Design an enzyme around this catalytic site. Structure first.
Site, PDB file in Angstrom:
ATOM      1  N   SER A  62       0.761  -1.257   0.000  1.00 39.15           N
ATOM      2  CA  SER A  62       0.000   0.000   0.000  1.00 39.15           C
ATOM      3  C   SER A  62       0.778   1.284   0.000  1.00 39.15           C
ATOM      4  CB  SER A  62      -1.048   0.029   1.106  1.00 39.15           C
ATOM      5  OG  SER A  62      -1.964  -1.053   0.950  1.00 39.15           O
ATOM      6  N   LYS A  65       0.349   3.436  -3.031  1.00 33.54           N
ATOM      7  CA  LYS A  65      -0.681   4.465  -3.158  1.00 33.54           C
ATOM      8  C   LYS A  65      -0.109   5.874  -3.174  1.00 33.54           C
ATOM      9  CE  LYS A  65      -4.351   1.634  -0.947  1.00 33.54           C
ATOM     10  NZ  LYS A  65      -3.582   0.360  -1.055  1.00 33.54           N
ATOM     11  N   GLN A 118     -10.753  -4.946  -0.472  1.00 31.92           N
ATOM     12  CA  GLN A 118     -10.218  -5.636  -1.646  1.00 31.92           C
ATOM     13  C   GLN A 118     -11.346  -5.866  -2.614  1.00 31.92           C
ATOM     14  OE1 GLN A 118      -7.022  -5.895  -1.701  1.00 31.92           O
ATOM     15  NE2 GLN A 118      -6.427  -6.132   0.473  1.00 31.92           N
ATOM     16  N   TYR A 149     -11.213   2.242   4.191  1.00 31.29           N
ATOM     17  CA  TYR A 149      -9.950   2.009   3.478  1.00 31.29           C
ATOM     18  C   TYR A 149     -10.191   0.963   2.360  1.00 31.29           C
ATOM     19  CZ  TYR A 149      -5.021   1.283   2.604  1.00 31.29           C
ATOM     20  OH  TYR A 149      -3.783   1.245   2.023  1.00 31.29           O
ATOM     21  N   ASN A 151      -8.736  -0.727  -1.641  1.00 33.72           N
ATOM     22  CA  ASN A 151      -7.916  -0.870  -2.848  1.00 33.72           C
ATOM     23  C   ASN A 151      -8.752  -0.617  -4.109  1.00 33.72           C
ATOM     24  OD1 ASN A 151      -5.348  -1.339  -1.753  1.00 33.72           O
ATOM     25  ND2 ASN A 151      -5.719  -3.469  -1.492  1.00 33.72           N
ATOM     26  N   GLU A 271      -0.994   9.984   4.924  1.00 32.66           N
ATOM     27  CA  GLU A 271      -1.817  10.164   6.120  1.00 32.66           C
ATOM     28  C   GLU A 271      -0.930  10.927   7.126  1.00 32.66           C
ATOM     29  OE1 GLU A 271      -3.303   6.273   7.308  1.00 32.66           O
ATOM     30  OE2 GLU A 271      -3.948   5.890   5.249  1.00 32.66           O
ATOM     31  N   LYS A 314       2.893   6.249   5.660  1.00 31.38           N
ATOM     32  CA  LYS A 314       2.103   5.227   4.985  1.00 31.38           C
ATOM     33  C   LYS A 314       2.631   3.859   5.328  1.00 31.38           C
ATOM     34  CE  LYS A 314      -1.536   3.892   2.837  1.00 31.38           C
ATOM     35  NZ  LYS A 314      -1.574   2.739   3.789  1.00 31.38           N
ATOM     36  N   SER A 317       1.649  -3.494   3.073  1.00 29.06           N
ATOM     37  CA  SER A 317       1.939  -4.916   3.216  1.00 29.06           C
ATOM     38  C   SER A 317       1.512  -5.713   2.009  1.00 29.06           C
ATOM     39  CB  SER A 317       1.156  -5.488   4.401  1.00 29.06           C
ATOM     40  OG  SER A 317       1.362  -4.726   5.573  1.00 29.06           O
ATOM     41  N   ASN A 342       5.399  -9.772   6.615  1.00 32.91           N
ATOM     42  CA  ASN A 342       4.269  -8.911   6.931  1.00 32.91           C
ATOM     43  C   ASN A 342       4.098  -9.004   8.463  1.00 32.91           C
ATOM     44  OD1 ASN A 342       1.782  -7.645   7.336  1.00 32.91           O
ATOM     45  ND2 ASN A 342       0.594  -8.973   6.030  1.00 32.91           N
TER      46      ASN A 342
HETATM   47  C1  LIG Z   1      -1.747  -2.173   1.698  1.00 30.05           C
HETATM   48  O1  LIG Z   1      -0.623  -2.699   1.740  1.00 30.05           O
HETATM   49  N1  LIG Z   1      -2.850  -2.980   2.005  1.00 30.05           N
HETATM   50  C2  LIG Z   1      -4.255  -2.487   2.117  1.00 30.05           C
HETATM   51  C3  LIG Z   1      -4.792  -2.818   3.507  1.00 30.05           C
HETATM   52  N2  LIG Z   1      -4.483  -1.764   4.560  1.00 30.05           N
HETATM   53  O2  LIG Z   1      -3.347  -1.093   4.242  1.00 30.05           O
HETATM   54  S1  LIG Z   1      -2.270  -0.743   5.410  1.00 30.05           S
HETATM   55  O3  LIG Z   1      -2.412  -1.568   6.545  1.00 30.05           O
HETATM   56  O4  LIG Z   1      -1.010  -1.218   4.666  1.00 30.05           O
HETATM   57  O5  LIG Z   1      -2.309   0.650   5.427  1.00 30.05           O
HETATM   58  C4  LIG Z   1      -4.492  -4.207   4.031  1.00 30.05           C
HETATM   59  C5  LIG Z   1      -3.028  -4.593   3.828  1.00 30.05           C
HETATM   60  C6  LIG Z   1      -2.599  -4.381   2.377  1.00 30.05           C
HETATM   61  C7  LIG Z   1      -3.225  -5.369   1.390  1.00 30.05           C
HETATM   62  N3  LIG Z   1      -3.144  -6.652   1.711  1.00 30.05           N
HETATM   63  O6  LIG Z   1      -3.718  -4.970   0.332  1.00 30.05           O
END
Ligand SMILES: *C(=O)N1C[C@H](NOS(=O)(=O)O)CC[C@H]1C(N)=O
Length: 360
Positions: A62, A65, A118, A149, A151, A271, A314, A317, A342
């Site tokens: 992430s 982003k 997702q 939050y 994707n 952020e 930011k 993972s 992770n």
């Molecule tokens: C970003 O890496 N992702 C989106 C989501 N939350 O992001 S944060 O914790 O990294 O800010 C879950 C983890 C990850 C993903 N698996 O898409």
């Protein structure tokens, strides 16, 4: 010697967290008073004994982003799009859908009305499946009211910014964004000649994990980069004025806050938090409920400059990697922490906070 003190500070922050979270390899890069410092620990691959260096490629998830946000900042500076544009203005397939009433800003800041974390598993990396997913989607609540939050949300923002520029997203990142930022070790699709630098990722029972294809993966979580290149990106963020004007403005567009959720101010990708702030508060802003639950927003009366006494950050993972990036504009301080496990966001923030405090 100051080098001894700096190594002691970074080692004291990193070493216990790596041991506690069984992290095989971890790269730290720090920008302090306009000078870079690198600290590399452990193994990029346990099987072949390849050590982490500042040139090792890690998946940043992430954190991608912030790059997506930069490309969108460029489309804004070029007047190809406006944050208040309706999403469907940029993709005819979306005309007549709920995207006629959702802004690009809503998409960028996860307030479109409940787009999920997702894409559902039923949506593969296929243009028609992605198109059909958005055409049928209906908000759970009013756009502009709740942050969830997502994707698919910022993924669509990036996809539409690329459409506004008349080129595929991945092509623009490779051909224009990364070269404009001076990033030669930053990739969406790692070249075969650079594969020897790509760290292995590790999950449960040390299963090997490298990110696989997914819908809008490039936009949401697809960057692979080194600690040295990600620090170069942080330094560009600390000093946008050093880049050619269009790119300086593109980076400035990612330093503007639109609303608050608790102690956090939401920008495009970045952020922000007041600085100083307690470690517990910074960990709470980067906690599981912030990623998984909806939150009512406190909209700002005007976009707020994310500069001065603030920490911009930011987390990112993938199944096998855990990244964290943070910088303090008013102190010319930047940090990158890349790992091939992770491990909990709270633990990444714990390392960062020990380093940032020690430097202060
Ligand atoms: C970003 O890496 N992702 C989106 C989501 N939350 O992001 S944060 O914790 O990294 O800010 C879950 C983890 C990850 C993903 N698996 O898409």
């Amino acid at each position: 010697a100051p080098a001894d003190r700096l190594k002691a500070l970074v080692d004291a922050a990193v070493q216990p967290v790596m041991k506690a979270n069984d992290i095989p390899g971890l790269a730290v890069a720090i920008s302090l008073k306009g000078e870079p410092h690198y600290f590399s620990y452990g193994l990029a691959s346990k099987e072949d004994g390849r050590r982490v260096t500042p040139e090792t490629l890690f998946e940043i998830g992430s954190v991608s982003k912030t790059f997506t946000a930069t490309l969108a900042g460029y489309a804004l500076t070029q007047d190809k799009m406006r944050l208040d544009d309706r999403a469907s203005q940029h993709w005819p397939a979306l005309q007549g859908s709920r995207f006629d009433g959702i802004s690009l800003l809503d998409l960028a800041t996860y307030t479109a009305g409940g787009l999920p974390l997702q894409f559902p598993d039923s949506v593969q990396k296929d243009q028609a499946q992605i198109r059909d997913y958005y055409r049928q989607w209906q908000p759970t609540y009013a756009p502009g009211s709740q942050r969830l939050y997502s994707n698919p949300s910022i993924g669509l923002f990036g996809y539409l910014a690329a459409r506004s520029l008349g080129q595929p997203f991945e092509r623009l990142m490779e051909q224009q964004v990364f070269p404009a930022l001076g990033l030669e070790q930053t990739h969406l699709d790692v070249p075969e000649a650079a594969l020897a630098q790509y760290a292995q990722g590790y999950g449960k029972r040390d299963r090997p994990l490298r990110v696989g294809p997914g819908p809008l993966d490039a936009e949401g979580y697809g960057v692979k980069t080194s600690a040295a290149d990600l620090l170069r990106f942080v330094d560009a963020n600390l000093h946008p004025e050093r880049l050619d004007r269009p790119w300086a403005q593109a980076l400035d567009a990612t330093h503007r806050g639109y609303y608050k959720v608790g102690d956090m101010t939401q920008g495009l990708g970045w952020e922000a938090y007041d600085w100083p702030i307690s470690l517990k508060r910074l960990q709470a802003g980067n906690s599981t409920p912030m990623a998984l639950q909806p939150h009512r927003i406190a909209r700002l009366p005007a976009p707020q400059a994310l500069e001065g006494q603030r920490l911009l950050n930011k987390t990112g993972s993938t199944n096998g990697f855990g990244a964290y990036v943070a910088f303090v504009p008013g102190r010319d301080l930047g940090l990158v922490i890349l790992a091939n496990r992770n491990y909990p966001n709270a633990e990444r923030v714990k390392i960062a906070y020990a380093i940032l405090s020690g430097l202060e």
